[PDB]
């Protein structure tokens, strides 16, 4: 899943790659190959490494489901992780199966 590319981790990577592409230090193909390596690496690290639980509550503003992908938008949300509170006015959630 090329799911985790638009994350801090994934975007910083793409931006770094584009520069190198811009200054002609690497080809687009090589950049693509790096992203592919990133997908395998982030996916693998998540399932095997991280292992904590989170909880959230809020009001659902919108939902969409197409191509087996859910896209939500919650308002006034409260993300709960043992060590307490994370409050946000708006959060967008994209989820693959």
């Amino acid at each position: 899943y090329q799911l985790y590319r638009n994350t801090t981790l994934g975007n910083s990577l793409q931006e770094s790659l584009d520069e190198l592409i811009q200054s002609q230090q690497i080809t687009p193909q090589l950049a693509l190959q790096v992203l592919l390596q990133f997908d395998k690496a982030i996916n693998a690290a998540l399932a095997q490494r991280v292992r904590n639980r989170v909880n959230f509550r809020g009001s659902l503003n919108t939902y969409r489901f197409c191509d087996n992908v859910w896209t939500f938008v919650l308002n006034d949300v409260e993300f709960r992780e043992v060590t307490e509170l994370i409050k946000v006015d708006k959060v967008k959630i994209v989820a693959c199966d």
Binding site: E19, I26, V34, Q37, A41, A45, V50
Partner: protein, 43 residues
């Protein structure tokens, strides 16, 4: 436990693309620039 995962992933990715850079004829210095650009953007 998050900066740790990121270091972990950056290391793995950098290590895993080294040969590709080499096979492409890209100087290993460029690889290190990537890691640097990448790590600093995180900050």
């Amino acid at each position: 436990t998050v900066p740790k995962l990121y270091r972990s992933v950056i290391e793995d990715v950098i290590n895993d693309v080294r040969d590709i850079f080499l096979d492409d004829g890209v100087d290993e210095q460029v690889l290190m620039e990537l890691k640097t650009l990448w790590e600093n953007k995180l900050m």
